Symmetry: D5
Subunit: 91 residues, 10 copies
C-alpha cells in the first residue's frame, strides 16, 4: 500500500550541534534500512527546505505509524500523510 508522506524538520534553536549530528546519522542509518527492505520506496529532498517528500510501501496503517513514530527526527517533524491508489492510465 502506497502513501505520500511529506516531512518538514523544525529543529529547536537550542539543539546542540553534537546532538544534531547524532540525530542526522541515526536518521540516515534508519532510512537506509527501511529503503533497502522496500518500505521506504522513494525519498526526495524538498528543494530549499529541511525536509523531504517520500513514498512508503507498507501493509497497514498500523505499520506506517510505527515506522514514522520511530523516525529519529519525529520530535521535530511536521508530517502529512495521504493514501495513493493505482491509476488506471498508469503504464
Amino acid at each position: 500500500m502506497l502513501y505520500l508522506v511529506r516531512m518538514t524538520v523544525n529543529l529547536p534553536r537550542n539543539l546542540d550541534p553534537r546532538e544534531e549530528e547524532r540525530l542526522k546519522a541515526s536518521a540516515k542509518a534508519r532510512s537506509r534500512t527501511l529503503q533497502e527492505q522496500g518500505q521506504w520506496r522513494y525519498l526526495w529532498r524538498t528543494t530549499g527546505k529541511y525536509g523531504n517528500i517520500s513514498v512508503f510501501d507498507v501493509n497497514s496503517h498500523d505499520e506506517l505509524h510505527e515506522i514514522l513514530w520511530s523516525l529519529p527526527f519525529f520530535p521535530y517533524l511536521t508530517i502529512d500523510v495521504e493514501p495513493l491508489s493505482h491509476h488506471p492510465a498508469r503504464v
Copy 2:
C-alpha cells in the same frame, strides 16, 4: 530533473457526455506517450478524488510548462508544481 505535480480535475456539469469521453481517452493516450518516453515518471491516483500525484522528469521549467499546458484536461485542472532534489540519504 524532477518535479512533484498534483493535479485535481473539475469537470463542469454541462459537459457534453461525448466531449467528456473524448477527453478521458485523449488524456489516457497522451499520458501513455509521456510515460513511455520517461518524462512522466510516476503516476498515482489520489484516493477518493478525481486527480493524481505525479513525478515529471524534464530538462527545464519551460519543457514542463509546455507539457502541462498541452494536456487535454488542462483547462479543467488545478495544478501545483514543486521542484524535487536528490536526497543525500537516498539509497539507489
Copy 3:
C-alpha cells in the same frame, strides 16, 4: 484498514426533481449494501449540514477508491480521506 472519510454534498440548483430523489434512493441503497457488508462501518450525519462523517473498513487504498468512486453522489461530493491506526490506549 480504517479510514475517516468526510463527505459534503453540493448539488446543482438546476438538478431535475425526479432525478434528485432517484439519486437519494440510489445512494441509500448503495450505502445499505456497503454497511451490511461491513466495508462502510460507521455512518453519522454532520449536524446542520448535507454530508456525513464515515469510517470505512477495507483491504486497501484501491478498494476504498473504487467504492467511493462508485457512489451515486460522487460527482457532487467533496471528500476528505485520512487513515486511522490502532491506538495502544484502546480498550479491547
Copy 4:
C-alpha cells in the same frame, strides 16, 4: 449523544522525560476507565501524528467538557469538537 473529537498532542521542548512518562501512564489509565464506563466510545490513532480521533457518547455538552477538561494531556492538547447526528441511511 455523539461527538467526534480530534486531539493533537503538542509537547513542550523542555518537558521532563520522567514527567512525560507519568502523563502517558496517567492518560492511558483515565482513557481506559472512560471507555469502560461507555463515555469514550471510539479511540483511534491519527496515523503519523501524536493524537487521536475519538467518538464520545455523553448526555450533554457540559458533561463532555468536564471530561475533556480532566484529561491529563489537556494542557498540551489542541482539541476539535463536532456534534454527530443519526443518519437516515444508517443500517442498524
Copy 5:
C-alpha cells in the same frame, strides 16, 4: 443544550422574483415559531452581511439537525455549528 450557529445566505441571481419573495416570508414565519417556542433562543444580524449569529436551545443533536434541515433557506445556507457549555463564572 445550547448551540452557537452561524448562517450565511447565498441566494442565486437567477432566482424567480416571486419564488424568492415567498421564500423570505416563509423563513420569517418559521423563525418566528421557533423563537416563540424557545428553540431559537437568540438571533442577531451579522453586520455588513446577509446572515445571522444564532443560539439554539434543543434537547439533542438530532433535534437541531432536523430544525436546520427544515429551514426554508437551508439549500442556500452555509452553516457552522458548535456546542456551548455553562461557564463556571456565569452570573
Copy 6:
C-alpha cells in the same frame, strides 16, 4: 450595542499553579462585576476548550477595548471581535 467576542486562552508553560489559581479567581471576579453591570451580557464556555464565547453590550468600540484590555487573562488571550446588528426577523 452588541459584540460577539470569542476568547481562547493559551497559558505559557512556566506559569505556576498559584499564578494560574490567582489569575482564575481574578478573572471570575472581574467578569462577575461586568455581568452585573450589564456590559458582559452573555458568557458561555467553548466546549472542550479553555475559553469562551461572549456577547458584550457597550456604547462604543473604545469602551469594549478598555474592558477587554483590562481582563486578567488578556495577555494570554486570542480574541475575535465582530459587531452584531438587530435582525428583522427577531422576536424580542
Copy 7:
C-alpha cells in the same frame, strides 16, 4: 465610531458594460452623499483591485448595516467589517 471596511467587487458575467457604467454612476452618487455627511470618512482604491478600503464613522452597528445594505454594489460585494478604537499613542485626530 470608526469601522474599517474592505469591499471587493465580483460582477456577474451577464452584467454588460452599459449596465456597469450606470452602476458606477449610482454608486458614485450614493458614496458622495455619505462622504459629504461624514459617515463615509475615508475612501481608498485597493491598488490593482476592483473594490475599496474604507473607514466609516457611524453611531451604531445597525446604522452601518443599513448603509452597507443600501450600497448599489452590495449584491456583488464581499465585505469585511472591523471596529477601530482610539490609540493611546495617537497624536492628532482620528
Copy 8:
C-alpha cells in the same frame, strides 16, 4: 504615497511587564515623532487586540521600510503592507 499597514504585537512569554512598559514608552515616543512629521498619517487601535491599523504617507517603498524597521516593537511585530490608490469616487482629501 499612502500605505495601509497592519501591525500585530506578539510578545515573548519571557518578556516581563516592566520591559514591556519600557518598550511601550519608546514606541510611543518614536511614533509621536513620525506622526508630527506627517509620515505616520493615521493610527488606530484594533479593538480587542494588541496592535494597530495605520496609514503611512511616504515617498517610496525604501522610506517605508526604513521607518518600519526602526520601530521599537519591530522584533515582535507581524506586519502587512498594502499600497493605497486614489479612488475616483473620493470626495475630499485622502
Copy 9:
C-alpha cells in the same frame, strides 16, 4: 519604484473562442508596449499555470493601478500586489 505582481487568469469555459483570441492578442500588444516603456520591467510565466510573475517599475501606486486596470485580461484576473525595496546586499541595479 518596484512592485511584485502575480496574475492568474480565470477564463470561463463558455468564452467565445474568437473573443479569447482577441484578448490574447490585445494582452500581448498591451504588455509589449508597457515593457518597451520600462514600466513592465520583468515578465515570467508561472510554470504549470495560466498566469505570470511580474515586476513593475512606476512612480506611484496610482500609476500601477491605472495600468493593471487597463489590462485586457483584468476582468478575468486574480491579482496580488506587493512593494519591493532596495536590499542592502544588492550588488548592482534593482
Copy 10:
C-alpha cells in the same frame, strides 16, 4: 533556469554575533550575485526577508546553494520555478 525564491528571517530571541551572520550573509550573497546565480535581490518592504530570482542549472544546484546560506537555519523559504513568457520582449 529561473526560480522565484521568497525568504523570511526569524532570528532567535537571544543573539549577541547577529552582525556576524549579517556579514557572512552579505559576503555569501555578494559572491553568488557576481557569479550570476543570485540574479535578483529585493527587500520585502516592512519585513525581515527578501524576494530573489535565482538562475541555476538544476534543482540540486539550487538546494545546495540555499542550504549553505548563513541564514538558512533561521529561514522560511518558498521556491517556485519560472518559465519563459511568450509575451516577454
